[PDB]
Each structure stands twice: as structure tokens, then as C-alpha cells.
Design a protein around this nucleic acid. Structure first.
Ligand SMILES: [Zn+2]
Ligand SMILES: [Zn+2]
Lengths: 94, 82, 148, 108, 99, 85, 99, 83, 109, 93
DNA sequence: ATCGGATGTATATATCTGACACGTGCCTGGAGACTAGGGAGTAATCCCCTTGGCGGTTAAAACGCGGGGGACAGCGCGTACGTGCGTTTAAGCGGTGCTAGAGCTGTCTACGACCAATTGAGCGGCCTCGGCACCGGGATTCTCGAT
DNA sequence: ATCGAGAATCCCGGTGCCGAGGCCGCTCAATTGGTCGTAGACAGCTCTAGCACCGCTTAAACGCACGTACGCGCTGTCCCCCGCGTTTTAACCGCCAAGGGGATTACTCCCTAGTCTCCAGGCACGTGTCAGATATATACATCCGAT
């Protein structure tokens, strides 16, 4: 058979069944969502790498990712995403 | 071998694109200029696509090569993987 | 403030209509800390078993869930030795609309029917899933010496 | 939070934290990766995904359909001030264009 | 005597029709032949996946639609409604791909 | 018909409802509860757990969170509460 | 009796003069004060290295020069020699800085 | 030590000099306010990123390298001050 | 080659090979770095630097000066064709602009 | 103190190869250093992405060659590839 | 078509001032030798997907014609911007003083990489029924010529 | 200002089909537990340069008057796109046939990371001098009004 290929389809569907419990999604739309998730992941994780390289560090912490989110996203998306990530980290640690 | 296939981008096929772009009236010399700029854009994209194919030691131009070339030129495309 | 008023309303509701086979109240002077006694449900192998547990109210209530912890040592796949419990309503899906009565009744239902999909302790959950006679025996023999 | 459970549920997320941690570690991004970075990154990704999906569902409901198609994604993205800025140099396949006719061209 | 629509009232109808749809407007076989002819210069005896041609067509159509969108604004700025080859050149120079 | 006092309340405060907001799921709750849950809670609906993040970002910008139609109805019947609240 | 140039010659002379030298054209203290005011709007009690202010001035002047070149081309496209705010708006729209 | 209405320090002669370098022969009378607005927007956009970069490093002085990095991120690379 | 001289001298270059190798290894690019990558990269960098320096020196000599200053580099880069496209989105400090006036603006005859 | 590395002396050596008479100021050296660093970063990043695409874990000379071909325009790319191949062939023997 | 003012720019000369080029000490990074292991090269196999072909039908392209509206040229008005001049403002240069904070060094603790077992999350393949596309008939709404 | 007729578009009901979604089996990667070396967090110290102030010159900014030439509106002409009918061309679709190359697996060898030792190349620092910027005095190119 074909080799295993990973994707975000299951998690995207899980998220979709929260905002709109009675709505489906096409295959091309799921592919577009997967591409968008991959692109944003690459953008943020590539900005954080240079942000850590500037200060002569070896670790990528939540601080670098937070500042990358601040630099990338627009004025209000950045605020909301920073709040969401801070809440997630706080809930994870404690 | 193929020759003079740029004439396949006919006048109606350009008028439809102009109408989608919101153009109400078109002059008669627009079509040749549009064909020229389209050929330039196609050459620019396909050069990098073929370079990506050749580096990977392959004989087929996959959609991944086109996606990578478009992203390299700053024309990120969503829908064909990547 | 708002949380103190909410706790006052909770006690008013509890006093007006006492809940089902549970009783909670402030053990000390501070209203933040509570103690609750739960009796063994009839449709369960925990007949005649009283369980004491402690309630800690976060300063930002009800927007943060309270923390429950069993004082006694009870055998169950969803409870550790330290007295914590494994309930999604408690922490995963808590909402400000829920009250302490709702989570207490959910704990009682969990006693009636455990959670094998995401058990907190894998070994005793496997024991539950494998056989019932040994699980029932050990549960009865520990609740006859630790619950009361 | 208490340990001995899946990492995605400790943070209350839906996107995987283990997969994000592995991709961050093996992505040639940095020599070391902190233990809290995958949580924050997964939270941001999930928030953005829900942000787009809610608007896409609203657009689909406006057209009496119960299934999201790329046209609805394009409509949702191009009608938002911030999402359009974020995905400004991005082309959605089979997404069309927004209806916009200049006021000069309209009949008088 | 037979019905005839005044000039300009059918172009607007096509504008309203084509902005509502999403399908590709260029025919597929001529575009495939054009892509293969253009690519035969860089490397000979190449093969194309079926998805690569469609990706190229989508990108080219989007680029041309954007270029025409800019050309319309250039034409309107000059106090006329007809787009001329001197608007495409100005748009391409300002965007940065002509210089 | 005109709602009674008992059937116009927020589930969080449990007291009289002031400045109602109506979520896309039609669940109603007083504005201070929403403002507080945005800061610390999961930004969902407190009652049925439906995400309203885009709704919040849309309406806070225009300051149209309050349900004006029901706010006047509740305010006219019970104005003596506002002095103590 | 007094001699004075016709309107237009001094403009061309200044154009030739300022396209030959490379010094900065905005006074340094006012630009420094404006930059400090904006930064204080962002984060209070900030300090500035001199090289930071210098780099900001260079970037701003280069950007303005490019924008004015595009504006001049836009104005010429409309059969004019005067640059008006609509030319700046069209250049910014086509370049993609305002959409 | 607050500062107010300092954008008036970008005088009309300075804008005329910039236009002359750009190659402009005749200038309308409403160009100056539009140019001031464009310059203010650009300065705000660059300074925001510079301040973010200097905040991530727990400093209080904005170095030239922060401005260079912000300009490079925005797509306008600058040669002469490092990098 | 003889495997005895320095790496830059062995390859016939002036840019260092050890420094390029170290920057490639410590730059978080790949888990491994080949033996011939630094040589190729140093050769390409040296070629580009030599081209730009040659053009800048030509401009400086035409200006009747014996020192390259940023104006000369700006002239050399903009007057070329491939180099202008390679550095299209790059601002040179103290570089000025190329001199040109639109034909419409010139006085009538 | 602090030691800060730069490409100043190599740029000067190349200049003396090309123009034995002309000198160079300090701002020009800063500009040349910035240019060299920028080109290094561009080529290295493109090569790393190319190595990642083909599921490799190393950067050989062919990755750098393809990155140079992708970045530099036509004649510049051809001459750069020629010089790089010449240097590699001279170094390997 | 110059005729001569009249202005500004280009050219040659003296000088003197700080930046450029080079010499010196040294110390930190690069070179040399060696070992081990895994990553990449090579060969063979499978089968999937790309290329090529044929016939039909019919949607879309091509060609032509009448004419109405839009592009372009020409005139005229007046007002807004250029040029030159005198007045007023604050930039620019120099020098002094002070301390906030960037840069560096030394300890040491807590966070992250590595390794082994192990099992449940998630991927691949199947199957089914409902959402959406399509077809046919009718109602609604722009559109245009004529009063 | 209007009424009516040809025409394009939207609504609604019935039929069919294919792909979205859920289920089952299973392999592998993520989790748990323990160990260890080292990154960076914190504290103390130095000394650099960023901020603030003061006095003098004169350079650039500012306000103003005159005038002219360029923008904007209006009118006219003519020719070139647009809308519609008819005919020709080939795109699209369904079907069949073949084999080229993509994808995978087993084996092996040689190329690169990691470690230690040693020494010399490049960096920080200091100093001599000439390239070029500035002031001064001619000489030519260019603009402007008008014979
Ligand atoms: Zn309330
Ligand atoms: Zn709800």
C-alpha cells in the first residue's frame, strides 16, 4: 500500500465541529486548510529561529514564539492569539 | 515539436479574463500585449519548476515543483498540496 | 466580592433544597475552603460507603473551576492515592454556568459508571476491564475499612 | 495541571502537541526547543483555524449550502480586514473574485 | 425594429456573471500545448503531471485577472473607460515587474 | 408577551440581568459576565460552549455587544434596581 | 528692467542639482524629535542610538524619493506635469501599500 | 517632557527638495499634507517593529541593528549600518 | 591538489573556506555539511564581490577619484542590468539616485 | 574586549587584484560586508530548503549549485556556476 | 536669428586636516590525525500513471455588418503655483557635566537531550446514503423605444 | 416626467449519482521513567555613550507681491468597438492500449561528526601622511528680450 502521509484533517474537522456543529467541508477546502496551517507554522517557526539567533541563544521558548506571533499577525489577531497562547501555556503548566 | 501555440489564447479567452477583472471596454491592441506578458510569466515560472525537477533527478514536472516555484516568486498557491 | 456573593447564593440554594445523597459546607471560618460528604449510590457496589472530600475555591470564581480532592482512600480507576479525581467536567470542559451541585452529581454518576476511555490509572482500569469479581471484592474490602 | 494524560488535553487544545513538538525539533529551526513552545504554537494555529472556519461557515450558510467549498473560504478571507492582510499574497484555487464594479462604469 | 441592446449594457452583464463564478476561463488543451512548448526549451523529453498543468493555469489566470484589475484603475485615472496597452505598461512598471 | 422577573436572569450572576448580550446561539447573558469570561475563560458560550471569537472581535470594535431591544424592555419595568447595582 | 527666469527653468536646475548630490534633505533635529515622539507613543521611556535615528532617516528619505518618482509617472500618464494627491493615492494602491 | 505636533517639522521646502530629487517639476498645493501622512504611517510601521525587537531582548535603547532587522523584515533591506 | 597548503590557497580563492564551513555548520541549516560546499560558496561570493568592485572602481576612475564611496557603488549597481535585478529591493546608504528627467518636462524648442 | 569578524581584508585583497591603484573608504567596506552577508544567507537558506524538499540531511555542492542557479540571473548564474565548479575541481585534486 | 547683458556653472591653484593604510602583539579559532557509524549510492522489482489514438457532438471560435458612443484635438478662461526679496526663526556647531545602562565575568541550578518499552492515536481501505447538480416550467425584474 | 413588449434571471419541484463521513484493522510514533551534561539565570562590576544645558552664527524657513502658463470645461468630428446573425473549427468526452518512470526494498562502503593537540592568522591598537574638501580668482555655457 501507499506510505503513511500525515495531515491536519482530523484536527481541522474537530475544530470545525465546534463553531458549526451542522456543517461539512469539501476535500479541496480541507486541502486548502491544510496548506494554510502548514504555511503559518513555517512562517512563525522560521521567524522564531532568527529571533533566537539574533540574541545568541540555542533554545526556542514560548517567549520567542510569542514575539514571532506579535511580529507576524495584524493588530488585533496578534492580541487575540497571544492571549490564547498564554492561556494554553498557563493551563498546561498548572 | 510545437510552434506558435500562443494563438490558442484567443480574443474571447482574454475578454472573459478582462470582464472578471472588471473591464467594461477593451481596445483592439490589448490582446497581443496580454499574450506577451502571459508568455513572460509562464517562462519565468516554468524555468524554476524545471530547475526543481532537474535537481531531484526526475523526468516529470510534479505539482510540488510548480508550487515551490510559485512560492519562491512570491505567489503562494493554496489547493495543490505543499 | 462577586465570588463571595456567588458562594452565598450557592449556600442559599443548598439550604433551600438539600441535594441528593451529598452534603457540602465550609469546614473553617473561610468560605473559600469547603468539605463535602458523599454517600454511596444505591446502584453501585459502594453501598454504605461515606466519602469525605475537600473543596478549594480559586480567587477568580466561577471563571476558574474549583479543585476537589478525596480525603479518604477509595479504589477506583479515576482516583489516585492522593485523592484527586479524573473528570473532564472538572477541568477540561468547565464553564461558569455550572455549579458545585452539578460537579458533585457528576462525581456521583462517575461512581455509578466509571470512565475507561481516559483512565487516570491504567493498571486498575485494566483490572476493571478484565474481570468484575476481583474488582468488586477489593473495592468492597477497602470501602469496608476506609470509607467508614 | 496533573500529568499522566495526553498533552493535547492538558492544554485544552485540539491540535496535536506531540506532532508540533516533533516538527519543531526536527525542522532545523534551533539546536534545542523549549517544552512550552509547542503548546503556544498549537494554540495559535488552532485559534487561526477556528477564526477562518467560523467565517467560512457563515458564508456557506448565507448561500443556503451546508458544505464549505473554496469559494466560501475566499469570500470569508477577502471580507475581513485582518485575514486579508495576513493572506495578502496568497491565491486560493477555485476561489474567484469579489464582486466590485467601479462607479464610473455604471450607466447614468 | 428587432430588439438590440445599447452598447455597454451587455459588457456589464458579463462582468456581473463572471465575477460570480469560479471556473477557469481559458481552454485547457491550448494552454497545455503552450506550457509544453514553453518548457521544451529548458529541458527536452519532459513529462508533466496532470496537476502541474492545472496549477500553472490557476496561477496564470489569477495573475492576469489582477493585472486587468490594476489596468482598469490606470485607465479610469486617465479620465476614460477604455483600457489601452499604455495602461498595462504603467501598471507593470509601478508594481515592479517592468522597471 | 412581557417576560416575568424569574425568566429574565443571567446564569452566572444569578441576580438581575443588566445590559444583555445575545450570542449567535441565542443564549443571553449580562455584559459584565461576558467581559469577565473573555479575559480568563475559554472565550466560548458559557451555556452551550460555542465559539464566538469572531463575534467578539466583530462587535467589540463597533461596541454593539449589547442587545439594545431587550435592554430597554428590562430597564423600563425595573428601574429601581439600577441605583443599588 | 530686472532679470528673472521664466517659470520652469529653476525647477529643472534644482532637479539636476539634487539628483547629483547624496546628502540628506530633511533637517535632522525635527526628524529625531518626530521619531522619538512616535516611539514614546509605542513604549514609554525609550533611548535611541544615533545610528538608529540615522538609519530611520535614510530609509524614510529613500522611500519618499521612490514614491515621488512613481507619483510623477502617474501624473504624466494623465497628460499633466503637476503632481496631485490622487497620483500618490494611485501609486500607493497599485504598489499594494493601501489596497 | 512629552512632545506634540512635531510632524510640522517636515517643512514644505524639505518635501520640495525630495520631489526635486525624485524628478518632479511642478507640485500641487495639497501634496504636503498627503506626504506627511504617508511618512507618518511608514515611520509608525517601522518603529513598532523596532520597539518589538528591542523589547524581546530586555533592553531600553534601540540599537541600529533593531531598525535594520525591522526594515529587512518589511522587505526594505538597508546596507550601511550592519547586518 | 597537494593537500598541504591552506584551504583557500589550495582552492585558489581569497575568501576563507574554514570560516564559511563553520558558518554553514553553526547556522542551523542542515544536520550535515558536505566537504565541497564551502569551496563552492566561497568561489561564488568572491566572484560577485570582484564584479561589483570592478564596476565601482570603473565608476570612481570616471569620476576622477581613487577611492570607492557609496555613490560609486550605487552607480555601478544601478547602471548594470543583472546586478540591478539582483539588488532590486536594496537601499544603499548615502547612495543617491540615478539622474534622469522625463522628456515631457524638458523645455520646448 | 570583543572580537568581531568581518570580510574586510578579503574584500580588500580582491579589490587589489582588480584595481591595484584605487583605494576604498569605510562606509563602502560596511556596504560590501552587508552585501556579502546577505548573499551568504540567501544562498544558504535556498540550499537548506532544497535539501529538505528531497528528504536529504546534507548540503553538498550540487545543492549550492542549484541554489545559485535559482537566485542569480542568467549570465551571472552561468558565470558563478563556472567559477564554483572550477574552484571545486581545483580543490579536490 | 542673433544681438549683447546677465546669471550660473565649470576650471585651475594653494593648503591643511583627519581618515586611510600599514606595523605590532597575541590569543582564539582553524588545521592535522584517528575512530565509528549511519547516510547515501546502486541494483532489482512492481505497477501506476502518463502518452497516444479514434470517433462523435456540439459548445465555442471566427467572420461580417450597421452604427452609436467614446477618444482626441482645438479654444478659451482664470486661478493657482513659480520666482525673487526682505524678515524672522531655530538648526548647527563647539564645549561641559552626569549617570543610566549595555557589556562582561563567575556560580550554579534546573531544564532539555538520549535511550528502552509499550501501547493507543491516527492512517489506509470499504461502504453507504444524502447533499448537490441538473432539467423543466413559471414568475420576476431590468431594458429600450415611443408616446 | 410615463406604458408596454422582448428578454434575461430567479424560484420551485422532482430525479439521480458520487463522494463525504463513519467504521474496522493495524503498525509506529508518542508517552513514561530515569540519567547526565550544560545553557542561561542571577548577581556584581566597569566605563560608554546617551541625555541635558548654554552661547553664537548664519543658514534655511517664512510671508508676500506679481504674473503667466497650465488645468479644466466645452464643442466638434470621425472611426472603432459592440451587439447580433451565420458558418466553420476543434474542444471535450468516452474508450482502448502500452510502457516509462516513480516508488520501494535490500546491501554495502566511505564520508562526515566528534575528540584532542598545536600554532599562526586575523583582530584590537597605535601612528605617519596625502586625498580631498574649501576658499579664491578666471572662463565658458546658457537664458532672455527683440530686432
Ligand atoms: Zn451576570
Ligand atoms: Zn450558547
Amino acid at each position: 500500500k501507499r506510505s503513511r502521509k500525515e495531515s491536519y484533517s482530523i484536527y481541522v474537522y474537530k475544530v470545525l465541529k465546534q463553531v458549526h456543529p451542522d456543517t461539512g467541508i469539501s476535500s479541496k477546502a480541507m486541502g486548502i486548510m491544510n496548506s494554510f496551517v502548514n504555511d503559518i507554522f513555517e512562517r512563525i517557526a522560521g521567524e522564531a529561529s532568527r529571533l533566537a539567533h539574533y540574541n545568541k541563544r540555542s533554545t526556542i521558548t514560548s517567549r520567542e514564539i510569542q514575539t514571532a506571533v506579535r511580529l507576524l499577525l495584524p493588530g488585533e489577531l496578534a492580541k487575540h492569539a497571544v492571549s490564547e497562547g498564554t492561556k494554553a501555556v498557563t493551563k498546561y503548566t498548572s | 515539436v510545437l510552434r506558435d501555440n500562443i494563438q490558442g489564447i484567443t480574443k474571447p479567452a482574454i475578454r472573459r479574463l478582462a470582464r472578471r477583472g472588471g473591464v467594461k471596454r477593451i481596445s483592439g491592441l490589448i490582446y497581443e500585449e496580454t499574450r506577451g506578458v502571459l508568455k513572460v510569466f509562464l517562462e519565468n515560472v516554468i524555468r524554476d519548476a524545471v530547475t526543481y525537477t532537474e535537481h531531484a533527478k526526475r523526468k516529470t514536472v510534479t505539482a510540488m515543483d510548480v508550487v515551490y516555484a510559485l512560492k519562491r516568486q512570491g505567489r503562494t498557491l493554496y489547493g495543490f498540496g505543499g | 466580592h462577586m465570588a463571595l456573593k456567588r458562594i452565598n447564593k450557592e449556600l442559599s440554594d443548598l439550604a433551600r433544597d438539600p441535594p441528593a445523597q451529598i452534603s457540602a459546607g465550609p469546614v473553617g471560618d473561610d468560605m473559600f475552603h469547603w468539605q463535602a460528604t458523599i454517600m454511596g449510590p444505591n446502584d453501585s457496589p459502594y453501598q454504605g460507603g461515606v466519602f469525605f472530600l475537600t473543596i478549594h475555591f480559586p480567587t477568580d470564581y466561577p471563571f476558574k473551576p474549583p479543585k476537589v480532592a478525596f480525603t479518604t482512600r477509595i479504589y477506583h480507576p479515576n482516583i489516585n492515592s492522593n485523592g484527586s479525581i479524573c473528570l473532564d467536567i472538572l477541568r477540561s470542559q468547565w464553564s461558569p454556568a455550572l455549579t458545585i451541585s452539578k460537579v458533585l452529581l457528576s462525581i456521583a454518576s462517575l461512581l455509578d459508571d466509571p470512565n475507561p476511555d481516559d483512565p487516570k490509572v491504567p493498571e486498575i482500569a485494566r483490572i476493571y476491564k478484565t474481570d468484575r469479581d476481583k474488582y468488586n471484592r477489593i473495592s468492597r474490602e477497602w470501602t469496608q475499612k476506609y470509607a467508614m | 495541571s496533573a500529568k499522566a494524560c495526553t498533552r493535547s488535553s492538558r492544554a485544552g487544545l485540539q491540535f496535536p502537541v506531540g506532532r508540533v513538538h516533533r516538527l519543531l525539533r526536527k525542522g532545523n529551526y534551533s539546536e534545542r526547543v523549549g517544552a512550552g513552545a509547542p503548546v503556544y504554537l498549537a494554540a495559535v494555529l488552532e485559534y487561526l483555524t477556528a477564526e477562518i472556519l467560523e467565517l467560512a461557515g457563515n458564508a456557506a450558510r448565507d448561500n443556503k449550502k451546508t458544505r464549505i467549498i473554496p469559494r466560501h473560504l475566499q469570500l470569508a478571507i477577502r471580507n475581513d480586514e485582518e485575514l486579508n492582510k495576513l493572506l495578502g499574497r496568497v491565491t486560493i484555487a477555485q476561489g474567484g473574485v469579489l464582486p466590485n464594479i467601479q462607479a464610473v462604469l455604471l450607466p447614468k | 425594429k428587432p430588439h438590440r441592446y445599447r452598447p455597454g449594457t451587455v459588457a456589464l452583464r458579463e462582468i456581473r456573471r463572471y465575477q460570480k463564478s469560479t471556473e477557469l476561463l481559458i481552454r485547457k488543451l491550448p494552454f497545455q500545448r503552450l506550457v509544453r512548448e514553453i518548457a521544451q526549451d529548458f529541458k527536452t523529453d519532459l513529462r508533466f503531471q496532470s496537476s502541474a498543468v492545472m496549477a500553472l493555469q490557476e496561477a496564470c489566470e489569477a495573475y492576469l485577472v489582477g493585472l486587468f484589475e490594476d489596468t482598469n484603475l490606470c485607465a479610469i485615472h486617465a479620465k476614460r473607460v477604455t483600457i489601452m496597452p499604455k495602461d498595462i505598461q504603467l501598471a507593470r512598471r509601478i508594481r515592479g515587474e517592468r522597471a | 408577551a412581557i417576560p416575568s422577573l424569574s425568566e429574565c436572569q443571567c446564569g452566572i450572576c444569578m441576580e438581575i440581568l443588566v445590559e444583555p448580550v445575545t450570542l449567535p446561539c441565542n443564549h443571553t447573558l449580562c455584559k459584565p459576565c461576558f467581559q469577565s469570561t473573555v479575559e480568563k475563560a475559554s472565550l466560548c458560550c458559557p451555556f452551550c460552549r460555542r465559539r464566538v471569537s469572531s463575534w467578539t472581535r466583530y462587535h467589540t470594535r463597533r461596541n454593539s455587544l449589547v442587545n439594545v431591544e431587550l435592554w430597554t424592555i428590562i430597564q423600563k419595568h425595573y428601574p429601581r434596581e439600577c441605583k443599588l447595582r
